Point group: C3
Chain length 519, copies 3
């Protein structure tokens, strides 16, 4: 509530480190055009497309604000500081502000274009706090507050999908008009505020394990429980006849002991060597990929269950569609090379989670007897058994922050398979739009739809602030620990900075799990 010559809000950014929590705030500049010429448009897949790539939905004239990525909040120094001293963290509070809003009209009369101020034009903004519109965040889409504060960004367009029977629709499909919501209209001088509180959520495990499930015992003392170790006879003359013999497992026969827990569930995936020539010479993806199909159409499990990337001393094999792959700065979005991308590694969970390329184990599948020898079968898909303990997938400075747990009758582990915190009531989606300004109407009344508007766009500043709780580490380890560092060697340009052309880049992915804990 001000005039045209008074600024609303200021540029805050920065971050504050307190005793048990950190407040990270960031401000950016945003631009917004008009979408679909102020029209809601039905969108069907295509005539003759693939059965799996079918979809029906709508596209609206509304934009929305995305900040669901760590790099859209944290900074490389702040991230390194957070992960090198903490065993966990989670969000606590959220604040959002829109200000310094300008609506600018555009005129075209020739090859040149002219831009002028339009002080009387409003802008509509509203937040879906009741979670009634479809939630499109948490799908790893583009367009959150660029990692560099100096970058000016663009508000993505909003759209949603619904039930479809092929390329068509069904009566059960829903249509949502976003103008049918109470929304706030604001001019140059007004501003929008919003506050939100996260619900209880488990701390993210920002640490590795210094122990292993299979090696969790005393290396000095035998077990007092007996196990069958021989079926033939040890004594002379009985080595060719059956006789059950029982031993006690000690430090030597350490693989035959009794145990309390089992490794996490498995869903096997194919393996690929980072060297091109070492792989099979065929286009096997989508024909040899672990995929799941529902309603008669297939789909690919890209993240999949949290499972270790490779074994020890491999460093060369990665599962097909088994880990997040990021893009380097200035990389094509279609058929990029292996050296132009950034494949994340989840080896830290080798201790608890089974490796993705290999199997869960073997199970007996017959009744052995004198005539028939015992036979087993390898099992590659494993559900949930009692006593199972596993670890969740790590999050990265560039990765997703949260997701919306679907409103369904059943859940097993609501932790998102792509990233961090799953929330029943996540931060609501803020949607912003430019109100349509009609051009000169006809002098004689006409009932026809008005389809001659004045072309104009908008720009402004958006501030976000999240308060995060931190879990401190108290480890009794004697020797030092592994931590994130910058290489001291000479380089043309330093990491996480701008080049001579002023383009910000991220060289490597950074994971949180660096400190250690005992199982």
């Amino acid at each position: 509530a001000d005039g045209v010559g008074n600024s609303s809000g200021n540029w805050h950014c920065d971050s504050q480190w307190l005793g048990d929590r950190v407040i990270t705030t960031s401000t950016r500049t945003w631009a917004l055009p008009t979408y679909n010429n102020h029209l809601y448009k039905q969108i069907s897949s295509q005539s003759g497309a693939s059965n799996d790539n079918h979809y029906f939905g709508y596209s609206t004239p509304w934009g929305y604000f995305d900040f669901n990525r760590f790099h859209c909040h944290f900074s490389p120094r702040d991230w390194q500081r957070l992960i090198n001293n903490n065993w966990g963290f989670r969000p606590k509070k959220l604040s959002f502000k829109l200000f310094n809003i300008q609506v600018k009209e555009v005129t075209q009369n020739d090859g040149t274009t002219t831009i002028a101020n339009n002080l009387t034009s409003t802008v509509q903004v509203f937040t879906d706090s009741e979670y009634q519109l479809p939630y499109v965040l948490g799908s790893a889409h583009q367009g959150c507050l660029p990692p560099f504060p100096a970058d000016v960004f663009m508000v993505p367009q909003y759209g949603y999908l619904t039930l479809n029977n092929g390329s068509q629709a069904v009566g059960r499909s829903s249509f949502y008009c976003l103008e049918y919501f109470p929304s706030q209209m604001l001019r140059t001088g007004n501003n929008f505020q919003f506050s939100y509180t996260f619900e209880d959520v488990p701390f993210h495990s920002s640490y590795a394990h210094s122990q292993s499930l299979d090696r969790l015992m005393n290396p000095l003392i035998d077990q007092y429980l007996y196990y069958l170790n021989r079926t033939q006879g040890t004594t002379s003359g009985t080595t060719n006849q059956s006789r059950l013999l029982f031993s006690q497992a000690g430090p030597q026969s350490m693989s035959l002991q009794a145990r309390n827990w089992l490794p996490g569930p498995c869903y096997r995936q194919q393996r690929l060597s980072k060297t091109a020539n070492d792989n099979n010479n065929s286009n096997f993806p989508w024909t040899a990929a672990s995929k799941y199909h529902l309603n008669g159409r297939d789909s690919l499990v890209n993240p999949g269950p949290a499972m270790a990337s490779h074994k020890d001393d491999e460093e060369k094999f990665f599962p097909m569609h088994g880990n997040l792959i990021f893009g380097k700065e200035g990389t094509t979005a279609s058929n990029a090379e292996l050296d132009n991308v950034m494949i994340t590694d989840e080896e830290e969970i080798r201790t608890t989670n089974p490796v993705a390329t290999e199997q869960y184990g073997t199970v007996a599948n017959n009744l052995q007897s004198s005539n028939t020898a015992p036979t087993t079968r390898t099992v590659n898909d494993q559900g949930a058994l009692p006593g199972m303990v596993w670890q969740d997938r790590d999050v990265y400075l560039q990765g997703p922050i949260w997701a919306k747990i679907p409103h369904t009758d059943g859940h097993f582990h609501p932790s998102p398979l792509m990233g961090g915190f799953g929330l029943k009531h996540p931060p609501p989606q803020i949607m912003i739009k430019n109100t349509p300004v009609p051009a000169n109407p006809p002098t004689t009344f006409s009932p026809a739809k008005f389809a001659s508007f004045i072309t104009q766009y908008s720009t402004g500043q958006v501030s976000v602030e999240i308060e995060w709780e931190l879990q401190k580490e108290n480890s009794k380890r004697w020797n030092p620990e592994i931590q994130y560092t910058s290489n001291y060697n000479k380089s043309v340009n330093v990491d996480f900075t701008v080049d001579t052309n002023g383009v910000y880049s991220e060289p490597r992915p950074i994971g949180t799990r660096y400190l250690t804990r005992n199982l």
Copy 2:
């Protein structure tokens, strides 16, 4: 506590719709004979029966009252009203009343029979509130308060099973005498009251989903995560040599995106076409049916996990033993025709739950390399993985209401696989019985068991009342919704009414899931 000429209780029936809850009450007339001639009888399976159809137990002279079906409480108009405006519901409170009790003696001297009043005879009634007798409700048995209030019904006989080693018993087996319980004896003039409160239970999802798991994203914006899309070379001269290539999934390649969740667990079942000639010409049931065996004996999963009946545009295939099948009025209980039954459809859960006839997907099962091409295997049985989200089976106007969760150390999803609400402490079983009236004893004392009683039966009125909580719908859908209606076309008789012979019938099954929600 009254005389012989004063009535206890009245006929209430009807239902009341309040702001956030509905009170449904119904009164019926019941008859009760004497069972087993006032004797407890041991019952074994048979000599020479099938191994799977073996059982040992007891049958008592006690009846019991059953009202564990929606049609025994609701009415077609009330049911349609409930399901067309609500997103859920659950039971809150229960009241039960027995009154207007008459004991009538029967005399036979010739082909004719005479019935007289017997004012001094009592009736025993008691409720197992401590859950000590076996719970036989929740097994889809016959004999609850008929759907039509004017119908007079019959109290079913009580019996139970125990451990058996073949047709015989084991020392671990238990015997329960129901006369060994504190019970209330009541004459003509007395009445029995009972009140009960349901424990906390999740709301039943009386809605479908307007979105799908595989289509939950923005149809306009690409993903920023890379995925391997090619193994050969795209450039000329490299189409026959291996080279990993990575792309970004957008609206076109919508089946290759990253996702957070997986469809519910699966347990595959055989498929049957509703057309007889389209099926295989063999007696495959019980020889090609998904069955589970314990203690060395098999058993059939009739409901099975909640899984979609068929794909889109099928409308003709149903799983074998994969959905509830109801009987039409006046239908034989042995080898009825397909047109004389009523097969329920669970297609509403196609969005989340996998189809029953098809598989969960495929999983890689080898280590591909230059020499060996990758190989996958189809998986038809799937356990529980992290990130799994599913939906429960719908309930119907004629279906079961609740069940008793077994008292065991472990549970995964205590929702009954046949129907609605699972309860650790369900409504207790009320048991009623006619006390034995001896005939004239011998003049000289004899220690022999008294086995000459006076033949008589009982009749009375039973009132039930359940208070149910309701969850209102607040949807932002623009277009109208699908709802239950009666066909306006001319017909000989209208649905859910009596015919010229005064026989009440139910033409079709009615499911609760009609409104929609976003995932």
Copy 3:
């Protein structure tokens, strides 16, 4: 805090039975030598050992106190009394005391040895209440308070493992120095006290089931739900053509009814007959055993999921590595005979848990049609499905009491697969050590490590006391129940006593599950 001639603490032992809880206390005498000559020693597996039997870790000069076994607390009469009247139990409170501590010096000058008092020598003791050192309890190791109170026992040595890449280590490995902890030093006259409270934990099911999952219904009343029972035609002339026919399942066709729940998850294991000649003539163990591998190395599931040992009337087959095996008194720890060990039976869970030797069932794996007949596949590995109900493994008088649930992001059923109660914060490990007493130092200062100490050991008394909650049984069973008893027949020596040589022995394993309950 006393002198040299005043005793600290007394010998309590005994047990008290109160209305709803039992307090079991026991005192023992312990001895303690010096370990590793007061040195921390790195321990690697070996050069050329098996890949699976690889390990890296450390061994310390510290002892620790173990009392994680029922026989180290209860007594045969107390155990029999507990299991013959109770439906459950769990720990409530813990108290621990160390007193009457003497440090004795040893001198060797010839074949003879002399032992003298050393009043000025201290002893170090501390409890890891913050759970920072690796937890080596709960691995079925040797050395808890002997079952007979008169036996004097030996304090086991402490050691731990860490991450290893083969026989070597990795930078992520941790080293813990136990001298780096605040510890209490105590002489002859001082004593150590400790108190602890268990966290909430489910009652242990010390009962069997009088009913079965597959037989949980009324043996007298048919079901009102129809099931496909025939695919051919029953009428004459249609027995060779397809026609779906539906029936109602009653007491006769009791294996084709509808049900609410499924048996627990399965993980098949091989079967062995107790008769040697009836088994296959090969050394199949470890080559036909259900095993799971992680980080590229295998491991054996000795307890495995809680699954029934055998079917009815078998009494001769046991799963390979599927139940706890105890040793008889004076039995060799390497290749003992079948008659010299004690194999526990878990048949009591046949009602709910599937048998270990057999499969979970069969699942359809194709689309049957006119041309192709339906085909099914047997499933031996089963995950977790909705509606699954199972039972946990029984505990024994000689078996483990508790275990430490690993600190991980995910758990399915934290009940240990080897035994009883899983605890996030179990009773902490008390560690005790003899401080090093230097021998005469050189007259001239030398910076070399001091490696000439005085040889001496320690002895003392340790008292433990646990308060346990009890769940009373209120069963309506008429006939008597099965209970534990001692055979009245004449014998050379009675059970659970000492022989002519004063050696205490345990003849048979005792399980808690003796009383019964309905599902």
